[model samples]
Structures are given as structure tokens and as C-alpha cells.
Target: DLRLHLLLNTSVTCNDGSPAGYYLKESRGSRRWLLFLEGGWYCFNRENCDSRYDTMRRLMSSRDWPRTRTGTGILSSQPEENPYWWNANMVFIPYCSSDVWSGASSKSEKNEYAFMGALIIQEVVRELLGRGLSGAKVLLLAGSSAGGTGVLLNVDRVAEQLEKLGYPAIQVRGLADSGWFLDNKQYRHAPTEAIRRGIRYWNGVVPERCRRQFQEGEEWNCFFGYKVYPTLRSPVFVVQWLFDEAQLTVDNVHVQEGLRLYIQNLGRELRHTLKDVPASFAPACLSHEIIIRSHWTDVQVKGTSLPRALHCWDRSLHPLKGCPVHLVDSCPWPHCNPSCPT
Candidate 1:
């Protein structure tokens, strides 16, 4: 059910001039295809780039590289381990460019460091088409953290391109795990600066469709995932933690009451911007990422587990209008604990 291949000669290449590759797990008798993008944050400056340069080496080879983290959780190929997507053909795309996989062009002055994340995706998907992805009846584009943001940014293009190839039967959807980052400038000084530098550093470009959604001075806002949500054509499911550790690292919510207020504020913002979201699971925990670990099944809100809720949403088992929003009791509740560790 699982086989790994490293396409060294494949046209896919990373920022550091290293070849890009993916791990494929075959699923017989299924028309579904799930493609996952790996996540690691961005590098905006020379210091940041140097720190990230070596990490790119890990994704260039098949033998010494760490096992792809994607073949776990909802993507597990074992029927008994992950019943819903077990038989679906899976492709795990590695991320090394650190632009949330959105940069379009590379700056030649930066020593031939290619910032070609967008092209890498196009090439990888094209290769998958030759291997049976063209006949896919259901296509799930998914990722976690940076990878989660990657799917959201690229899902529309992927679906549109595939549809042009005459596969109208394919139902393309996306799942973004812990990918939402608030657009507020308050308490986001560090991240905001990084975004500003990153836009120019990698020659990072926004999707034309999404860029049109922002005004003149606000064009830079397109870098945020929430800013592009309104422009996304395909339905997407957003999986997040209300007290997301990454966001809190930028926002610095210290007190229990402060954390509660932040969660409510985030919920309100999510409700306002996620008009096109098919469904969302926002548990009130300080946990960061999901979907890559077995704990994905253990996460719960109210009496329902996260995986079960996703299953219900996927099957249309119930009306999704005003989807059931799940929130835990306030931080001071007897069972509620509020702590985020570094």
C-alpha cells in the first residue's frame, strides 16, 4: 500500500538550487487523491536564509532524509488506521523555500537561490497526473502550519488547472491545519516586519486573483491567509486551535483572562472572514499544529472528536449552515488549563 520514490531528475527544484521531490503511497481501488505540503516557517533575511539553507538539503534526497511526516494522521494508508482516506492515493510534497510555498520568482542577486515554490507545485502536480491523479474523483489539498497556508494559497490554482485538463468530475477541496494568522498589526510587530522583508527577499508574489481583492496601500495584506479567503473558489476546511501557540507568540497573551478574550476575538474575526469556509474545527487549546500527529483523533470539543466532526462535514451527514462552532469553557474553568511552552 506504501511505496516511496525520489524523482531526483524531476524538474522540481528548491530555493537552494537543490532538486525537489515527493513520496508517493499507492492506494488501489480508490479514485481519491490527497496531496500534503510539508510546513516550516519562512526566512526573510540573510541571517534567516543562512539558517534555512541547510534544512533544504534534507528534502533533496530520499535515503538520509527524515521520513515524510505527511503519511500519518488523516493520510495514513492503512485501512484500519485511517479509514476515511486510507485508500486514497497520497503525495507528500516537501517544503523548503519558506515562503508558505507562494513565491513566484527568484532574485538573481541572491546567489541563484531560487524562490520557485509556486512552480514546484505545478510541476509536482503535473507529474502526479501521469501517475493516475488525472482520473481522481476527489482531490484533497492539505497541509499543516506553513504547509497549511501553502494549500490555501495554491488550492484554487491547482483545481482550476486540473479542471482545464477536462476532469470536471473531480471534487477539489482543501484542509488548512493551524494555518490562520490574524491580519491585525497590533502585537504583530515581529511577524509584520518579517512579512515586509520576505515579500522582496524571495520576490514573493501573490496570486493575481487574490491581489485584486486588496486596495492600493493594502496590497501587502494579500500575504495573510485570511485576506485571500474571500477570493478562494473551492470550498476549504480550516482546522485551528483558538489559542494558537504561534499567533500567541506574536500577540503575547499572558493572563488567563487575556487568553480568553483573545480566543473570543479570534473567533469573531474567523467568523467574519471565513464566509466561504465549508466547515472549521477551532478547539480552545494552546496547541500549535495538528494533522501530522496521532493526536488529531484525540482532539475534541463538547462530546465530538475532531476527526468525527470532519467526517460528518465531508459526508454532509448534517446541515453545515452556521456550522457547529466548538469552544471550551473559559480558562478558569475547573478543567481548563492555559499554558503555552517554548
Candidate 2:
């Protein structure tokens, strides 16, 4: 139940021009497919990319990608752990582009590197279609951290891709974990600069509608989940920690007097931001990603675990017996939920 087949699509490459691919665990006779993208922070400049290639090269290139990978959390095969998608085909799409899975450029004369994060996904899905995705009934594009951001940016495009490919009936949705990022006054819009640089470095492509909403030279706003959420045509379920650790680091929210005040506001903001997404689970916690961890089922918001919420969301797509589940902590403090990760 755990063996994986690493399938590389040479049509796409990582930041270093190395082929990027996915680790597949197939479930025969099942029409459901879950493609979970690996989440890793990105480098938005030549200096940052150079340092990244020298240090965390695995994320910048697929030169040494493993032959196999273990599927955990939502991708787990055990019924007790992953009751929803245990029998569905699970594929883990590795992250090597260092562009948060949105880069659309390639190697050039002036550029010594290639950033094909989004292309990797398109190519991977094309390859998957040849191997049974042509008959796929449902495909769930999911990720955490940067990959979670990927879901918001790519889900609709993916669905649209399948439609043009003549598989218009295929149901496509997204499940984003700890992917909702903020852009408020307190953090001084910390993500703005990084995203602006990253977009140019990666030659990134944002949703067309989302991009049009902004003025020229400011499409970078599309990278933010809240900004892109409106343009998403597909149904999406979001999983976020109210006090996301990554945001704290990015915004430099430190442990000091009035820190709790900032944290409380962040919690309130995250909860409020989730208002648009009817199906979500946002617990008041101080962690980054958790869906891939064993505690995915243990952590609950308003007595609803992530697994149960996802399951409920999945059923809603069927247009049958399904109800919306939007669970968020109303409390004004972090670590208030005993079920969340400490």
C-alpha cells in the first residue's frame, strides 16, 4: 500500500534545468486522484537563488530526487488515519522549482536557471491523464505552505485545463493547508516585496481575472490567497492555523510586550479572511503545516477535524448528501485549542 513509482516528465524542469516529477501510489479501479504538491519556501532573486542552489539545492533541482516517497496525513492509505481518500490514487508532486509552484519561465541566455513550477504541474497532469486520468472522475489539488498557495493559484487553471483537454466532466477542487497569508498594516505588507521579486524572477503567471483587478505592474497581489480567492472558479476547502508560524516569521512577529495583542488580531483576521471560503478549518494555533502529519485527525476546530471537514467537502461536490463545514476559533488567544499541535 506504500510503494511509489517516481514518474518524471521531461517536458518540465526545476530551477536548475533538472526534470521535475511526482511520486505515485496508484489505486486501481478508483476514479479519484489526489495530487499533493510538496511545500517549500521560495527564493525570489538571483542572490537568493544562488544561495538556495548552494544550500537547499534539493528544492531548486531534481538532480537527487528520491526514488520513492511516503504518503502521510491526507494521503495516507490507512482508513483509521485517512478515512476519506484511503482508497483513492495518491500522488505527491515534489517541489524543486523554488518558486512556490507558480513559476512559468525557463532557462534563457541571460538566465542560467529555469523556473517551471507551474509547468511541472501542467506536464505532470498531462502525463497522469495518459495513465488513467482520462477516466478520472475527481481530482483534488492539495498542498501546504508554499504548495498551499499553489492550490489557490492553480486549482481553477487546472480545472480549466482539463476542460479544454476534453474532460469537462471531471470534478476538480483544492484543499489548502496553512496557505492563507495576510497582507495587513501590522506586518507592513511583508510578503509584498518578496512576491514582487519572485514574480519577476520566476516569470510567474497569476490568474487572469485576479491580475486584471490590479493595476499594471502590480499583478503580484494575485499571489495572496485572499486576493486570488475571488477569482477561483472551483470549490476549495482551506485548512489554516490562525497564528501561522510562517506568517509570524515573515512578518517578524516576535515574542514581546503587545505580541499577544498582535497574535490576537492575526487570529481574528485569519478567521475573518476565511469568511469567503465556506468550507474551512482554522484553529487558533501557532504552527505552520499539519495536514501531512499524523495529528491531522486529532486537531479539531469546533469539534470538526480536518479529515471530517474534507470528507464533508468532498461529498458536497457530488451534489448529494453533503453539508458545509466552516470551523474557526472565535477565541482571542493562540494555543487555546487543546486539540491543536503544541
Candidate 3:
């Protein structure tokens, strides 16, 4: 049960129309479950899909994924490394459908690609219900980058789906890492605009309350974590690097004089956006994702490591608001902490 098992679904598929899949590491008698969605390159819509695939085709297709894969960070099977969920049933879902796990579309003649990211997760739960999730007591759906964004978009839905699928007792939660993107002016292609286009092409579904908060044209704002986080029914533990490398690119610093201010502004905005979140870890690392990093245990905010914060989150009751553990780097400077990885 410790060994990872690759399982492919016939009906579900990646953007390339190949079978969608996930890796499962079952814990013999554990009722706890944690599923980590793979995060990486993403194409918001078909207009940019071809361009993204040019560099990372493997992200958009299942044909190239290795038969065997290693789990890192929260998915790590070693107790010393992961601590909290090492012995729990773990599932690692790769992100092959570049719709950032929001799309529900399938392959067709009009569009040669399938955007079934949302469906893929739901179906996996249905599939795993038989595999062992039927006995699950706690289910944590966590992901970084695009996959983390996906968790914000789908955590409540997964809980709702489980209820409809006849397993209403499972406690569902989320761990979104480095996916809380801001809609800033620095980016040529605005986050709001990109998500708007994705909504149409991917036929994405934002949370019901989020959709209600905005008008028809503005509902795409829900794609941003801060916008949707308030409406999420399931508790979510937010993990973000203050000077995220990925977002820093979008918010380019064209001049030497502007670099510091830009980074500081990003840090401020990030802190502002995450202020209300009950449980969060905002380290001042100039990196992107951390949960999958080998040194994930090293990065910390006010002496609390990422793994430790996550453990406290799991332990606290009413983890969404009751978990009084929101740690942020007081230093606004980039990579100010000694634990910052090179």
C-alpha cells in the first residue's frame, strides 16, 4: 500500500484527448485521505494552448507521464519528512488538462482538445470511493500553482459531489499553494481577462456565491483566490511565497529603481489579500511553490514552518476560521529569511 499505483480513466482525458490519470499510495487501514494535484504550465484558453504546449507538451497530455513517480512535500510517504499525513491514503493527480482544473469540456471535432480538469477530480473521487475513499473520514484536496487555483475553484464542489455520490460523511478541506494570483496592472494580459476567456473556452464553473457577488461580465473575478476564498464552504489552508517568482514575472520590474518597490508592493498586496484567511503561511521567499520542494520544511514565517502550519491546520477544529495560525513575513524585502532556498 505504500507503493504508488498509476490508474488511468477511460472516459476522462487530458487536453490532448488521452486518458486522464492519477497515482495512488494507499495506507493499509487509514481512513484519512489527501490528494495533491500537480501544478505547472497552464493555458487559459485554446488561443494560447498551442503556444504553451510548444515548451511543455507533457503538461497537456498524459502520454509522457512516467509509469512511476515520486511524492514530495505533503505527499511524501516518509514520516520524518511529511509528519502529519505520511500514513494517510495519498493520491497525486497530474495536471494534463491545462484549463487549470476549471474546465469541464471534452474533446470534439470543433475543438481537438479536451478541457476536463474539473471533471477529472470529481470522477477520481467517484473512482476512488470504490478503491478505499468510501471509508474516508477526512479528505484534503491540496495543490500548488494552477492546481492550487483549481482547489479554490473546486473544493466545495468536491464535497457536494461526494454527498450526491452517496458518501456525505467525508470531511473535505483544501490546501492551496502559490495559486492566489492578483489581478494587477503590470501584466499585459490581465488575470481577470485571461480567466474571462478561460471561462468561455473551458466552460468553467465558479462557486455559486462568488458568481452571485459579481455581475454577469464580472463573475470571472472568482477565478482569483481572494475573490472566491470568502465563499468557499470547505476550509482551506493558504500557502504563498511573498515574492512569488511566477507572479513577479507577470509583474515585471523594467528598471533597477522599480524592482524593490514592485516586490514590496506585491508583498503588501499579498498580505492584504490574505489578511482574513484563518490559517495561512506567507514566507518571504523569492520562489514559487514550496509544498513540493525538498526544503519545504525549511521555509517558515515567524518560526513556523510550512509543514507545521499545515499540521496545526489539520489538528484545529473549524479549521477554516477557528485555526488561529496566520503567519506572514514581517520583512518586506525579498528572500529576507535564512531558510530561503537557492
Candidate 4:
């Protein structure tokens, strides 16, 4: 029991020690609990998220080179050269689940695949609990973009497992940054026909010879907000970027409308689950850049996201600085920029 108690008080850090900015860290908290989750990347779906370790290695060390920051701000300069820098404190065993990218065979299959993949990850968390790691304190589950979506959809299942085992499910904390929160079916690919087409691009299987198709009656539907709301029983963190061009980006007309739909359905209920969801925006920073310079991403981290670049915490431009202390006018939580939530 002493050894087990000692294990509960120790922090575990793992990393491929790359510069691509991705890894995992676990330590014993004040109570008996464990938190496990992963981040996201461009073109990430199943193969990508699950193969995150390999992907991080390839991007950080790839001859092809990933994007780099010009000088911190968009206008500051150009992506000098993607050094793909990251800390040596991150490590994760990516989940190979169903998603648009994973089960490219069909849109339905892709969605179902992601759902099941999420379930698989949850099951893993369950087992981690079974091993006496995720005890009765808090299961600090968080992620941004696709990873955020995963927590929203699967928290209830994890909570159910804890309840069944008579374990105290203290809280399910989630931090979703500029995640494509809605389902494919929600938008109907409005404003930009390109977005709709892109949906097909993602849903289609890259076969030897065949154009992508967005068929009806598939196994998946982009109803994440709908699927996650009812059973979401945790304090969730919602972060967004004003200039993000991703699916649910803030200023993008279509993105705003889509988010409106998602919120109209789950906003109120989630508000209760979340202690205080702070929103922030990064001006001139894209999906990948903010991860390196943002503070909001680290609000949940024991340290600061700035201190650990491998976390890739700010995919949605959330500010981890300020808030829970300072207050400014018309500003988003933590900190605010002129163009935030534009």
C-alpha cells in the first residue's frame, strides 16, 4: 500500500523528446486520480491522431519540413524554416480509432470509426483506473480541435465506468480549442462551397482510382454537439480563435453560424458542467503558431504552455494568462486582443 501510495504521489513524464511539439506527462495529484489525453495536427484524423508519435517525429525531423513562425506574429516575418522544435518531456500512445481520415471507405464509417476510437481511448482510461491510477479525485481530460471533440463525446462513458465501480468521478475537465465542434450534416457546407467539398475530401477514401463521395445513410454524422451535450458531466473549457479558417473558426461567417447551432443546443447544459469556460483569441496566429506562444493552453497544465512547447496547447488560441485574477473590459477571459472573438 505504501508503494501504491507513493506511485500516486509521483509524476511520470514521457517523450520522444522531439521539437515537433507533442508528448505526454502524468504525475500523482493531491488525490487518487490520473489524466490522459492527446492533441491534434493538420490533416489529423484516425491514422494521424493514433500515429501521433510517428507523425511528430516525421514533422520535426522530416526533410519535407513543417511550417515555422516568421517572427512570432504573422506580419513579423515568414516561416523562416520549420525547425519543428519541441521539448523532450512529451510522449503518448496515439489512439487508432474511427474517423473521417481513419475509415476513409465511407463517411458514415469514418464518423463511427472516430466514435468507436474515442470509446477505445475511454476504455483505455477505464483500464488505467482499473490499475488504480484514475482513482477518486479528478480525471483531467482535455484536448483541442479533434482531441477536444473526443472528450466531449466520450466523458460520459468514462464517468459511467467510474460510477459503476463505485469510484468518485470527481470531475471530467475538458479544454477544447477551436475544435470543429459540429457534425458534417450541420453546415450542409454553406458559405463556401469549398468547405462542403472539403468535407467530401476528408470523407472520401483515397483509393487507387475513385473520386470522393459524401453519400447518405453512412455510419457517421457530424452531430458531435448533439452527441456530447446530454451526457457531458464535466467542467469544460471552450477556446476559440478569431481568425481561424478551420471549420468552427470565430470570424469565418460559416464557422460562426455552425457554432451557433451547436451552442444553441448544448451551451446551457455545458455551462453548468464547466466551472468557468474562458474564451480567447490570437491575432495573426494560425492553428499551429499559437500552440507555441499562447498561455491559455497551459491554464490546465501544472506548468505553463510556454514552458513546455511540446504540449501544442493552443490550437484554438486560448489565453492561459490573466483571468481568475485580473479583469479587463470587452476582453475575453485570461487575456484579450483587439481582434479577439471578432
Candidate 5:
């Protein structure tokens, strides 16, 4: 049940300067829409870009990719498997720009690749609106890894776009999973520099609205969730692990303390930065991804399961209380669980 919509507009193109599109799955008797941005780690250099260009160029043609399965966690089509969004129309926005769907190129040429992720996101949503997204009662925008960062970066603009298109009544929400990279100076080896380089190489543009909040030179830092979360206008539910393998891999000299401080600081910042108490769940797991993992349904912090918590937040139940932000003090170890299974 996947339909590929090849955008005919000349403004939207992938990293290779070719046309791009999105995959859609319609649900029966549901006006809800779930848009998930696919995550692929970005390319920052000539070598990296070459590798990504070779692989991502194929995505320009819908026929090149195989049919997608709407299975597991948020994407599961079965009502019993995923009651929260099973009936919601699901969309998979492939990441082909190698820029986490956030950059924009200034060039105008067939061979000149534009890191026009912000433009791509806009065009895709616009096309969906033309196709009937205006009638949507609820819209859930989400992504994992780089795509997760994309969610945080683009959520506000996407909501504004929908509102301008006359869908102000639609309740728009977001979920950023395992992409909340910190701006801590402790991890000097972190990908901060690469992110800066990526932005320059692709000419990726930050949201104009966000530019004012950040300093002239600090705009690139907004690419990280910690920096951009404050400016997000829409309600975005964040799901992450305290011991994110990616973060730990770079700054794991003191793995235990580093992760603990990271989660603590993240929670504090999330609470203080947003006007509303942001809802989040931080499990003590050594993994980078949440929704796509096999343990997504089974893992728990306190007593509630991950999927159940997400359901509660999405439904406005506020089940846990005080913004319902839960972080696991007890590490899921040999007794509760073993290492995170990738």
C-alpha cells in the first residue's frame, strides 16, 4: 500500500540535483497523518559526499527503491500492533540530500546539487496538502537519528506552513527519537565540526525565524537539538536513551557518569527551554534508536511501557503527571535486560 509521489516541481531536488519524492500509505477511516523522515547519517566532506551521492542518487527514481513495509512501532499497520497510529495515513520522506533534510543549496544548475532539505520538506508537505492533508485531524511529524534532528529543526516551520495553507485547526505534533545531540564542550571529538562543515558544503539554511534567536555565527549550532529545541513552537515529544551509543562512542572515557550527566542536563534544559513542560522518556539503555528497535514495546521506565507512554502523550492523557517526563534511575542491566540489541 505504498504510493510514490514524484514531485513535478522544479524547486525540489535530491542531493544529486535530481527530482525527489515521498512514499505514502493510506489508512481506512482515519484523518490522522503520520509523517516519518528517514534517517541516514549526513555527509560532510568530498569523500563522504561521493559515497552518499553514489548511494542516494538512485532514490531519485521511485522504481529504484523497493516497496516499504509499514511495520513495527509507529509504522505498524495492524490495529493490535500499533493502536495509537495504525489507522493514520503514514508517509516516509526519504533522506536523499545527505544533509539531514535541513540544508539548502544556492546554486541553479542541473549538475549543481542543492542541499535544499528545507525546500524539499516544504514541497512535500505542500503536495500532501493538495492531496488532502488539509482534512487531517492530527499530524505527527517524526524522524530518527539525523531525521530526528530534522524533526526538531523543521517542526516549527512545518507547522507554520500548514497554518498558512489554511489548516490552522489541524493539531500538529512531533517526535524526535535518538537525535538530541548535546552542545557540551566535554566531547570535543563529537560531530559538531562535521555538522558545521555539512551546513557550509550543502549551503543548508537554518529557519529564518530561528536565526534571530541565535547569534550571527552560532546559527549552525542550531542544527543540534539542544540548541534548536528552545525555538520550536509546536509541542514535540522526545524519546531518547541516556546511554545513546553514538554519544557514548565519542565521549565514553567515563561512560557511566558521562551518560548520567548528559541525561540530567538534557532533562533540565528541555524543562527550562520550552514554555510548556516537554514530555520525554529517557531509558537507561545503550542504544541509538527507539521506535525502530525490537525492544520499543517492551522497555519501561518506572512502570509504563514505551509505546504506552507515547500513546498517552499523543492522546493528551498526560498519564504520568508533571509533564510526565520519566528517566530511568535503574539501569536496565543483566537482571532487567542485557546490552541494547542493534
Candidate 6:
């Protein structure tokens, strides 16, 4: 039993070790759900973890990092050659702890939420294979936004785990709606963007000698969503809305671009194709009122951003009644809801 320091959210889900993974008792109707947790940035311990592991700290320390906004929203340092490799292939993490509501346990803790989630997921699947749940039949697998990224980032590991347990024929049943796999360097944090750029610059400089070269027919799908597409694991159902301004445009800009490159390199036949968002969420709109959706626990303050040239404080000002979610019922997620009272 790999007793890991399970994050709070996953700890809550696996409290009894039932729905998650336990001593082998498939009781979720006919199907079962396995959970695992991924590692955080730089695989650093809690004392000094860096969420920018996949991008920044993976090469050089955050101190020696380069600032992108020219001292605006990034660190100013030299770009480290990105020589890091993904942990595994075919691993799926869960991102549904209502993180935005109460905020993660530790903001500066890096990608603890994502990494822990992936590790727990991997453990859960290992439990399943041990219980003899393998073969040609497909099994249902699900994950939200970040978890979707886990899906692509760890698909191979999942497949390999099954095979290692003597079940090579087991296929990924069907991927349901939630979030999707895209590029992180383009859509995630500043460090990730910088890290991606550094890697790209190196690749451009030595196209033939690039360590992370893409193969044909394995393009767009490389964006976390298609990790298993070319491997013949299973088909998937993507659920993305243009209303998701954050992941679609606002926040995930460069990462999305990276996803495009990932697919183009994979070749055309791969599911690397970006499909039109469902027509249901066509007309999107946000509240045009004084909304106080900023995460309450995000910081020690209750009120939203307020700063003059002097005294500052925290108090509940007249915030909007609701958010775009209320206006648009099916808006699964809006702007990563980073502002919500997590």
C-alpha cells in the first residue's frame, strides 16, 4: 500500500477507501473508479515545492528564471534548456475538489493538487488490475480540466500498468465530458509559457537534434487530450465551450497554441483535430454587475481587490448576485473560476 500524503480533497474522497480504491470490492454498480495522484512541480517536497516544475524549475531554479512581462508578471532570468521528461503515459488525475470554492490548501504549494490527484489515480487503477478487471471490455474514465491534462500526460502509464498486471486487452471504455487535454505551456502559468518558449527556441535552433520531436499523425491530440488516441486505447467525447474564456482564450493562450503544434507534429489522422465547441453554449455572457466572486479563501481577505495610495482592508462590498454559471446553466466551468470562493 503506497501510503502517500494524499491531498485534502482526495483524502476526503478516499476517506473510507471505497469509491476510490481499497481492498478490492467493485460496488459502483457494474463499473468502478480508480484514483491516483500525480507529482507536483520539480517533484519537490512540501517545504519548497515549485508548481512550475514541468516548465521552469525543471531546468533551473525559479530565481534564475526569465521574466516574460519584462518584470511585469514573470521572473527575469536566463532560459534553461528544457530537458525534463513527463512522469508516465496513460495516467488520469481528478480535478473536482471544488478548488475554486475553498481554494487549495496551499497556493504556493505548487501543483500539489494536480500531482497528488494523479498519484492517487494511478494507485486506484493498480488496485483494479489486481482485482482482475481487465480484458477487451472498455471501462469508463473521467476527469475535469486539469485532470484532463493528466489523462493525456499519463495515458501510457495507465496502459502499461494494466499490461504489467497481465491485462493488455483492457481498453479505455469511453471518455466523458468534463475538461479536456490541451497544452499547458501556452495556456497555463507564466513560468510554463517561458519554459515552453525556451524549449521551442532550442528545437528551432536544432530541428534535427531536438529531443522532443513530434511524429506525423500525432498532432493536435498531443494536447493532454489525445495521449491515448494514437495508441488505440479508446475513443473520447470532448466537452469544451467557447464560453470557457479562460481555457479557451483568456488564460490558456500559449498553451493552446502549443497544443496545435503538438497535433501538427502528430500528423492529421490523430484526434489532434480541434472540433467546434458544442452549439448549446453558443451565446455566452458574464455578469455586468459588481460581482464579488473572487475566492474568499484565496487570501486572508473577504473583499475583492481594493488598493489606493494608502490604507487597505478586507470587507464584503456589494458584489453581484451571481456569475456566468447562473446565467449560463451548462457552463461546466467559467474562466477556471479562479475568482470563485474556493
Task: Report the lDDT tens digits of candidate 2 across residue range 193-284.
Answer: 87888888888888778988896779888888888898888888888888888888888765564776677787888888888678888888
Q: Sort by lDDT, best first.
A: 2, 3, 5, 1, 4, 6
Model 1 residue pairs with clashes: none
Clashing pairs in 2: none
lDDT of 4 at 49: 36
Error of 6 at 153 (Å): 2.0
User: lDDT for model 2, on a 0 to 1 scale?
Assistant: 0.83
lDDT of 5 at 305: 69
Name the best candidate (by TM-score): 2
- Write one digit per residue (lDDT tens) for candidate 1, span 62-101: 3355544447877787655674576778888878566778
> In candidate 4, what are the lDDT values of residues 178-220, reduced to their tens digit?
4434333333323123324433434422111111122353323
Best by lDDT: 2
Candidates in order, TM-scores: namely 0.83, 0.94, 0.92, 0.44, 0.83, 0.37
Relative to the true structure, how large is the alpha-carbon lDDT of every model?
A: 0.69, 0.83, 0.81, 0.34, 0.70, 0.30
Candidate 4, residue 204: CA error in Å? 16
- Residue 21 CA displacement from its true place in model 4, Å: 19
Model 2 CA deviation exceeding 4 Å by range: 1-9, 186-189, 255-257, 319-324
What local lDDT does model 4 show for residue 302? 22
lDDT string for model 6 (222-276, tens) is 4333343444333433433323333334344433666655423422221223432
In every candidate, how many clashes are there?
A: 0, 0, 0, 20, 3, 57
Where in model 1 is the C-alpha error above 4 Å?
1-3, 7-11, 54-70, 106-110, 185-189, 215-217, 253-278, 317-342
